[PDB]
Symmetry: C3
Subunit: 218 residues, 3 copies
Amino acid sequence: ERVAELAAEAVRATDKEEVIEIVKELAELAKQSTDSELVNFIVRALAAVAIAAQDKELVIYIVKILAELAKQSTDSELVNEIVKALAEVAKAATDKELVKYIVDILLELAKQADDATLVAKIAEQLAEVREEAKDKELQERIDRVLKKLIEITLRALEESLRELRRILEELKEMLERLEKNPDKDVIVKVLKVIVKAIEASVRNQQISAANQKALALL
Amino acid sequence: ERVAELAAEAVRATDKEEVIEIVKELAELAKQSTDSELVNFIVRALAAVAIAAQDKELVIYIVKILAELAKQSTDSELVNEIVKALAEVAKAATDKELVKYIVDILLELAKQADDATLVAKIAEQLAEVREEAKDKELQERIDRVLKKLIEITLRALEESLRELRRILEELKEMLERLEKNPDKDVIVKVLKVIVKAIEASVRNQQISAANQKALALL
Amino acid sequence: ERVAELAAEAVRATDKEEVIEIVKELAELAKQSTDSELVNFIVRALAAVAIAAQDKELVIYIVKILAELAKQSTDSELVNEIVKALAEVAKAATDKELVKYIVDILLELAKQADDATLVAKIAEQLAEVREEAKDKELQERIDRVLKKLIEITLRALEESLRELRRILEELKEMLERLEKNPDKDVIVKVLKVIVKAIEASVRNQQISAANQKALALL
């Protein structure tokens, strides 16, 4: 495909202006494209271009593009692979300020993400960066961001409990209606609220587990 | 009101004997008073008296009074505001031994508190003290108390699980009764136990989340 | 009994060859024995023999035997007491390499154990060893194993959530069957799945709590 040929042109890497032209329309092709498999191949190729080559302006522009794809995307599987791409670029970086900018980008991605499971995966990639990072001050900056991500999952767990106590209260009031009249219609109504309580409880335990994972990564 | 006029007399702070007379009947007015809003204004005013002025005997007596109000109180919202008052007095303290006594008081408040959510809020105020405390040995004493509070929430989470497994067993035995006879009365009985299981599960997840918060504060 | 007389022969401890003969058939008596109370007395006596006496070959053989009993045993209460026996031998050890071998054995016991609650108890005994161990490098090895045990409970919590989301989906599809026909038979079928969802939720909260305990032990 044209995307496959455009990836072959990036292998040459003759000039920075050439690469900038490629990564431009590679981002435009990734935008407004439904196939996530295609976007994932574009994401891995763009990350390889940023991992290789030189110039921070090229790497920053690739990082900005990858972040933009994650902001627009509603697929957590694609945003995760983008986060993994940003983590791999930071691991193979010779400038502390470059990884500082990438980590702060991943921090902003987690603030926007509604899924607490995604904040846990961002915290895992940030923990993997810190393991191989060496050099303190940089690692201490990672731990500061990791503690910010744990604060995100904590607030998300608080909202999930409040939603769980509210549905629980509706369940106690719907059970209050059942005591007065033991009709069939009141039973299936309590059954619906019980299912809604189970679903809200499962969601709360998923966000609870994502918080515990972020705690272990610290 | 007389409480408002008594707070104005404390603004003068001419003599320690004057202040002791004020904080005495301010504590007596707070005791046997139903309005928590009034007690909260008394608590904030007493904390401002302890934050200002001098002499540890005055501050210790104010701390003892605030602790006594929290022991008697059954309102977690009021006990929390009292804990926040004890934390603010400790943050603006020039004697390490004074904050050591205040922290050990907050530790004793958490041991008495039945609510694991309150132990988490006490751990948050203790964590806020340690952040601005500086000077090691003091911070290491805070972390020792913080680990004691985590042990409190762990034991509370164990009791909640045992209560959850017991209700679960009643649910499995009540479901065992339903298989024999699928009557209406046996259905609404299982429905009652399911609601009791949901309620016990929600309580267990609240105490679980309070434990995770105490873990993050460490 | 012969086991009680064999324990009396170990009190003498005249020769290493004598003790090796005793601990041999003490292990053979413990194997293929249904009474756990008897095995527990054999386990405590063998641990006292390893805690006392000398020679690592004797202690290693006793440790191997205790580990073998835990691998075969399906009783978590017995495996726990065996883990406590391995922890007590390591606490009263004058060779760092001996406790390193015992800790790595306890690590292998936790990998085999299906119960996440048992991995939490192994982590508690490993935490107790580190508290009294002194000498860094050894403690850092304990923390590395403790972080491995937390990874075990995390993966166990992930499997429990996936099992919980699957049963939840069956619950949502069984509730989908109830909307079409509000028969009695479809109600008791949803009631069965609700009970299975409650049971799976309780199991997930037990493994969740075991993970939080391992986090606090770190």
